[PDB]
Design an enzyme around this catalytic site. Sequence first.
Site, mmCIF file in Angstrom:
data_model
loop_
_atom_site.group_PDB
_atom_site.id
_atom_site.type_symbol
_atom_site.label_atom_id
_atom_site.label_comp_id
_atom_site.label_asym_id
_atom_site.label_seq_id
_atom_site.Cartn_x
_atom_site.Cartn_y
_atom_site.Cartn_z
ATOM 1 N N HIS A 33 -67.165 -28.452 29.525
ATOM 2 C CA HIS A 33 -68.541 -28.065 29.707
ATOM 3 C C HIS A 33 -69.541 -28.429 28.612
ATOM 4 O O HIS A 33 -70.653 -27.900 28.599
ATOM 5 C CB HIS A 33 -68.568 -26.534 29.983
ATOM 6 C CG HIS A 33 -68.016 -26.225 31.348
ATOM 7 N ND1 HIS A 33 -68.678 -25.433 32.264
ATOM 8 C CD2 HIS A 33 -66.869 -26.618 31.957
ATOM 9 C CE1 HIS A 33 -67.970 -25.358 33.371
ATOM 10 N NE2 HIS A 33 -66.872 -26.069 33.212
ATOM 11 N N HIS A 68 -63.174 -34.836 40.249
ATOM 12 C CA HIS A 68 -64.283 -35.249 39.405
ATOM 13 C C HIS A 68 -64.004 -36.742 39.289
ATOM 14 O O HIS A 68 -62.968 -37.117 38.746
ATOM 15 C CB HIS A 68 -64.160 -34.639 38.006
ATOM 16 C CG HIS A 68 -64.561 -33.201 37.920
ATOM 17 N ND1 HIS A 68 -65.703 -32.793 37.268
ATOM 18 C CD2 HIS A 68 -63.941 -32.071 38.333
ATOM 19 C CE1 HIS A 68 -65.770 -31.475 37.279
ATOM 20 N NE2 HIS A 68 -64.711 -31.012 37.918
ATOM 21 N N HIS A 111 -72.731 -26.205 40.842
ATOM 22 C CA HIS A 111 -72.042 -25.882 39.600
ATOM 23 C C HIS A 111 -73.012 -25.223 38.646
ATOM 24 O O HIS A 111 -74.185 -25.595 38.606
ATOM 25 C CB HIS A 111 -71.465 -27.143 38.964
ATOM 26 C CG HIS A 111 -70.282 -27.696 39.685
ATOM 27 N ND1 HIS A 111 -68.986 -27.444 39.285
ATOM 28 C CD2 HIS A 111 -70.185 -28.484 40.785
ATOM 29 C CE1 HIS A 111 -68.146 -28.049 40.105
ATOM 30 N NE2 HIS A 111 -68.847 -28.689 41.025
ATOM 31 N N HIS A 115 -69.402 -22.990 42.247
ATOM 32 C CA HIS A 115 -68.925 -22.695 40.909
ATOM 33 C C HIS A 115 -70.069 -21.797 40.417
ATOM 34 O O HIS A 115 -71.100 -22.284 39.961
ATOM 35 C CB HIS A 115 -68.820 -23.970 40.061
ATOM 36 C CG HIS A 115 -68.572 -23.711 38.604
ATOM 37 N ND1 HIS A 115 -67.968 -24.630 37.769
ATOM 38 C CD2 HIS A 115 -68.856 -22.635 37.830
ATOM 39 C CE1 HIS A 115 -67.892 -24.130 36.549
ATOM 40 N NE2 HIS A 115 -68.425 -22.922 36.558
ATOM 41 N N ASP A 142 -59.013 -30.167 39.934
ATOM 42 C CA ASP A 142 -60.213 -30.043 39.103
ATOM 43 C C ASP A 142 -59.966 -31.148 38.059
ATOM 44 O O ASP A 142 -60.054 -30.932 36.851
ATOM 45 C CB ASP A 142 -60.327 -28.657 38.446
ATOM 46 C CG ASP A 142 -61.707 -28.384 37.889
ATOM 47 O OD1 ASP A 142 -62.581 -29.258 38.013
ATOM 48 O OD2 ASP A 142 -61.924 -27.292 37.325
#
Lengths: 101, 100, 100, 566, 566, 566
Positions: free
Chosen positions: D319, D135, D218, D245, D359
């Site tokens: 999230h 990311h 995602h 994902h 991740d």
Amino acid sequence: MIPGEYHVKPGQIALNTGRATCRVVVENHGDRPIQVGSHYHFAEVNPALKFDRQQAAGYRLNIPAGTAVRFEPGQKREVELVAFAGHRAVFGFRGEVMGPL
Amino acid sequence: MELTPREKDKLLLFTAALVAERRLARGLKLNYPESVALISAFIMEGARDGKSVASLMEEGRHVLTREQVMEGVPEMIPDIQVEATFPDGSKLVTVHNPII
Amino acid sequence: MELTPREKDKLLLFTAALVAERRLARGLKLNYPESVALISAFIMEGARDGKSVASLMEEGRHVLTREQVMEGVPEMIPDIQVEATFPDGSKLVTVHNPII
Amino acid sequence: SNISRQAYADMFGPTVGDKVRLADTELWIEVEDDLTTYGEEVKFGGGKVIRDGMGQGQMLAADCVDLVLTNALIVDHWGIVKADIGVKDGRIFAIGKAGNPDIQPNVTIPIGAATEVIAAEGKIVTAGGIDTHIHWICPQQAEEALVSGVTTMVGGGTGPAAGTHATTCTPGPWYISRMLQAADSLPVNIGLLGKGNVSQPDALREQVAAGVIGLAIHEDWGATPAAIDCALTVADEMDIQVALHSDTLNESGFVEDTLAAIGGRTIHTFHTEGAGGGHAPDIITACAHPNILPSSTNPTLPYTLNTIDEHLDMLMVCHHLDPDIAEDVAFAESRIRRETIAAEDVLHDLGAFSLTSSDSQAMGRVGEVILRTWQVAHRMKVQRGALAEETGDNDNFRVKRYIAKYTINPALTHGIAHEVGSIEVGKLADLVVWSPAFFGVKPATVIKGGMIAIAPMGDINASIPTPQPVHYRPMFGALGSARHHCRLTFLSQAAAANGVAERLNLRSAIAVVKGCRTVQKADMVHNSLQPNITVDAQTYEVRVDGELITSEPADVLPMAQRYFLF
Amino acid sequence: SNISRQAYADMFGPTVGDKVRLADTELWIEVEDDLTTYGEEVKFGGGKVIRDGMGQGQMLAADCVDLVLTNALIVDHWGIVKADIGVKDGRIFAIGKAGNPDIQPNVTIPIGAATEVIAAEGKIVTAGGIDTHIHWICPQQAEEALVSGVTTMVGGGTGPAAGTHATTCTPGPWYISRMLQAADSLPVNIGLLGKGNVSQPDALREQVAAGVIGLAIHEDWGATPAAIDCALTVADEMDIQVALHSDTLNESGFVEDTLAAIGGRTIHTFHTEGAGGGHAPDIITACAHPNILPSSTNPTLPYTLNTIDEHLDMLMVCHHLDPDIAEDVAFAESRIRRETIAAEDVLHDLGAFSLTSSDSQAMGRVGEVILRTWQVAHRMKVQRGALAEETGDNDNFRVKRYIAKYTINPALTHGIAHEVGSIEVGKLADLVVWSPAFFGVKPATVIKGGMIAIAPMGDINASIPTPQPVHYRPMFGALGSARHHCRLTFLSQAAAANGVAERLNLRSAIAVVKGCRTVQKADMVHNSLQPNITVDAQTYEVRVDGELITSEPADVLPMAQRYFLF
Amino acid sequence: SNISRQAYADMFGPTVGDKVRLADTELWIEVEDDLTTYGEEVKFGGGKVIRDGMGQGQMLAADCVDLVLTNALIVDHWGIVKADIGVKDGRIFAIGKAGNPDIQPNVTIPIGAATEVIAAEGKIVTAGGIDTHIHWICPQQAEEALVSGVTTMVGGGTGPAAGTHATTCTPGPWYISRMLQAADSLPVNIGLLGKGNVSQPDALREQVAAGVIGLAIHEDWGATPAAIDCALTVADEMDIQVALHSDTLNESGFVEDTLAAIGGRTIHTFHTEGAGGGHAPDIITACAHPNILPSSTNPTLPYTLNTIDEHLDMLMVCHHLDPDIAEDVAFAESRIRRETIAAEDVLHDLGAFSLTSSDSQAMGRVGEVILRTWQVAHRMKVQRGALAEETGDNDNFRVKRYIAKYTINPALTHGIAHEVGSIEVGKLADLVVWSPAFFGVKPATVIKGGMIAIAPMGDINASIPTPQPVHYRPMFGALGSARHHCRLTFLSQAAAANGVAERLNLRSAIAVVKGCRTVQKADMVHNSLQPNITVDAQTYEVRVDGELITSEPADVLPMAQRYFLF
């Protein structure tokens, strides 16, 4: 437990196997110490070291790679030599051969 | 102060040592980075006091013992080297097998 | 020491905490950055001692009280998070409403 | 003459039959082969072998290597052997016996005046790691990863923005172009992933044409069957990879519906265990399929005492969930299952899971991919013993299986294995040198494209490079133009054809991805197991062939408190 | 359905009628308007609105924005409103309602696959600050200012040299060229000022042709009537701005003589109060003139208990004065008057002073321009109450008046308002995101040209970007080529025409200044008051229309000890 | 009017007859000449001389300098004089009297609108140092050296690799090209040295054609007569310099054999004393020859109480020797002789040794070349008193002799004296400004190519640049394109002709070396003594003309604990 420790199996390694060797008596006639490396062309070492240069032609010290033999002033000792391999072409050192042999 | 890069770098070592110092005080067995920082800082202060290189090469082996550090640590540190400004300029101090 | 960027970054947090620690000692009401640094450093040492994540999530709420910090500070810190090397690797500690 | 084995190991490193402990773990590697001719090893230093006319020849630059790593102990998926490594033109030239053909026998790697030397005797050399779940939240991640031993980073992002916090997506042509330009400043090979969540093909094609080498789907952007099908259709026609994902909420269907939408097409599943995201609670069953290339993210590797406690708050922040919203907390809780977490470690040991990734800063630690992979191997050896494939009294096979997880397999999955991924001739010289005591934790040297890019460095003003403080510092391989020459920016075949590199005025070397659609589970090195795995909807228990799969949580781990200051 | 206002504010930020406290001050803003359609707000996260087919459409990149800031509370000179902000091609696209026109009503900012998202709910968004009094003493100043929320820096200098220590002048073609080149490495928009102290026009024209966007006249180089007239003549013909630091010594004449020399031509007066320099003791009277664009430097803002004590030694070091030379200390003392210092705060509140600046490292703090502007507003509300222009029970008008001081007004004064200065469509996307508790003190996000350039960032190796330690770190917008694409180097129309950018091989985007001669006091947003102000030659008392203007020194200030570690 | 000498010195710095102590040493310099016209000195500041129509003229940029250093006390090999220094186009324009010809007499350095000012009154100005023994082990070395006052670095390396740890060699075309590219990122002038240890000329010619300005022969790669002869033959035909580190082991012959191989050809001998390497124990006898340009490395300068103790372990790590191998430790011990160490200091004082260098991170300290040179001068004055060449009651001659060691002599030895090396018109403006109390220890300003590149800088957010903490920070001269314009990359005539700069796309200014073969001992400024020196093979005693040469070890040294935090 020791991080990254080795577990070397016991025994010995035979170096430079299957190659011509010869022993030579060498004496340092200089007033300063002389140290010779494993892969140096023995026949072209410091002129102060007296020995049969003709016999040492195309030879190097029969010692583990990276080690050396030191000769203090006036020191006399018998060393064992092993013959060069590969192309058997000598370039450099004192510039006495600069070609095959 | 006109701090040069080398002086600012040494401030990192000093601070790292402050961490180890406190942990040792609590009674913890020091790890690899803590041990190196603690002994290194000790030598730097030795030089500031004016001790000789020879004296420190010796004294440095009596800062931490084998029972004050984690297992395997003594073997991870075969030696420790650090430089500091002695009264006669910068000198290198090499302590062999500092932890015994 | 072979300090990685993350270890050197944590040295910044430790030092920031040293500042707050001294001020608290004088009897000052800590401000926002001082409070965060003080509680964060506490948790890091907790991990070094080998305390569990669960224990620290609790203990972290009893480092500083509402009367030891400036007005508005408790509300500026709804939570505090920091990671450290626990005996079982890096773990994240989240302390909710640390100052009460 | 003759020399004892111990004295020999101290001088040139271990040889055939000798075993070496990996850091402070219980894993032991044994030297399988030695390519040297005893007595003819090359060594550098005052009065050593590598000197004019001796271990160094008279050949011109074109006839000798630029760099030689002497007496290295190679640990790769294909073998654990002792040998010299030759590097020429930034690429791996040969793996053999270095020296001067004029006086030495069996020289395959010629040393001449144009040859630099790196002494690797007593060191373990590996290929650079490859993380496929980055990311791009901050540029600082590249240094952190490089220091850990990862030389290639694949992922997406635009910086610390909500979208990047949650997903590995570089949204659209403008941001893709901007990030491709910014990549020239980073010391790692890079490949970008675009936002693949759309049901209009052209919106995806534009992105691929702009430069991305893959499309990441995602759930935060909606991982619906339509979106998935759309992305896979474009992937199939542009030879780029799709990373998934899945829908944790089971909002559009269950795992079987997603698998149906995939329709047997090649796809890389992110954090297949589920904690990092995926159909609750059985996304883990995907590893049974031939078209699925499964990977794990690192916070769950390996199962320890503090794993669970740590996960809930981590999930929320990543999230953008609200702890005060019942539905947000319930969906978070449905993702953290002790049952699947424990099974994951075993599935890795068996080869059912083929890759490991981070991740980065979104339920993953960027500098712990390698470290954690080895901790899992340690814990698995401790709990399960030798693998059925082991031969001899060593962990050689288990080591090859695990190293492939963050090296060759990630490279194969994303179609860049022709450039990096392992120590094989013709591949980019991305190598990492490790001292056995710090293997997998802190590297001695990190080489990029044939130039050292980062290494531990002592006092700059010291008389030697060893005095304290020693910490990682950028080297010449990470500087301006030398960096550009030693790194790769991966482009899609379409972008390369469109002249994207010239238009954006990219300064680094360019590489093109290919073979993303043809790879399948069977191609994953040492990790091709397709188990008959099931998950109980109620108890969350994982079973393979009816047998229960599980492991115990570690209280203490190697490669942890003994090496880190914090 | 229905939702309570409190729950609504916690989810999407405040709406119409809700008030918000600015940091820890006494200033309260009230939302004047909300551009959303209740129930259709876009939100990002796992299982939220911005997902394929839902809040995200199927449009191609060309038909949607690159970046959207959701649920932002805009605070600008034109209004304090709630809305989504669309950014496309590095510029402000629209201020309205974002979403997918396929299923949502009133969408003015379309979100598609090419759209990145920044969640601004509960955050205040403003335009980047603009400091027009920079001394380029060190490059480190750009980072300090960027972190504070200032995205454009105008000034002059060559580094830590005597001339730059005292003045904002980049002397001549060679240094101007050198600094224009060095500017490509800095993450802020830049415009240079040359040395305007000369009585030969050609010496000034060369400088303008070399690249400067203005000419700074400082008393250290001799602020004589002849020099002033010369500089203004060239400014009038080249459309560049003149910034003045008048003759404190009254050596060539008094303030009225300087004003006479100016001859009604447009000019920007630096630190008009006088402490930073100017005719003693009445330079402050310049703010009464229509052609004068007055600004303040920050060390005197606002008047506090320690202000005076601090000034004497600060003055000496800056101007290279000698404390052992009677005349040097007397001239320093004639500059520090409690009377003018106190009046300055009030004149700002009234709109007589239109700009605020730093005067970086030369009697000014580069990272405190915004912070101090708000402290003055706080102290003025506390002492004088509501402004005559206020409507409702809020400080909205006072907030618009003060924000204009470091945003739109500086932009208008230097002819760059067509590029930056406010959040208006077509302008460069230089935005700053603030959490209400840290407004004006520490930003959450600083965006440059559509890319985040700097932001607070936690542990790089952490599982999320929030763990400690959190401190400001450079982002992708500050990296190599991406930086060049996201910043502007302002040139004079002459330099642009001469091909200066191509000759120097400048990599950043170029912008040209224009409209420097036509701006007047009446054009300063919310700060156009031309008061009948007088200063008593003996007592130094400031009076407007005969009434005495003064204020009281603060003992404690907001945005101070509660936020800083040191 | 009239002014007392003391008040005069406090205002404009010392004048003719005044003496100044160098830092905290016993060395005193006396101003030999002052080029000013009393009463017409130019001074900058509020209300000073350098103002329009006064000390500043109306001339165009072409008719005035870009930078002027006012009232500087120059300390160079040619004189110790007071004067203004003019800098134009990045080069030294003139050394004389600055001002405005319109109203001032004897102005040789015209000041105009395009002139920046640096106040040097009370400061000592010198040329930038030049270190010719750099091991490019890490890029961080450039900053360390720049801060110390060294502006040009000559050496070789590829980073922290075994070969570079031990030698100053950039092996072959690929690495040479890579390093030439990386050099653009460093703030110092750079010239590379290749590996000269080969008996095949073409292997050397390729390297010279690739870009190196010299060939370094080190015993680690085999310093044999054949290799030496080969390198000298190529040097003679390509006009590049050869730097030698002879055979300590006496393996191929003694010092006389090496000297014979050299055959009277020009050559630069590294660490001629021997501790850093060379025929044991008499390499020091080389300084008697006309074709030998001898230099010392700094760890042995000057002989102190801790010197010996420190050397053994330092030697081992540098040359990759093994303390467990008898032959390795014996050869290390044969290199450290108290006798030669003590004699070296005296030979320097006599001018037998002509240069000083570091030998960075390989038995040398990169930031202590200047510092140690002055410590030797101090210790020699203390022990031996005035030099036979001294005139007057000062140490002026000894100061000129020692400053030449790290400035003009290194420049002459490597054929770059036409570009740098001293403060003479036409040379690059690489200058260092020192406060007398910190001379040789910590600079006030370091100028590169006419732009300040590094200087001490206080709080970035402070109201002035003086508040704490003050530490060295990079300035505009060290930034991107401005850096390229202010630094030089030296190439061999062959490389320049081959278009190497264009092919590698080098951004910095290029300079070519020439005159490397024609320089001899007689050309070394103030250090041309060719003594009849002998060394006793047994006792290691050094004798000149039969008289014993020796000195005593210092217990405490100046420029040490009083200035450093660690």
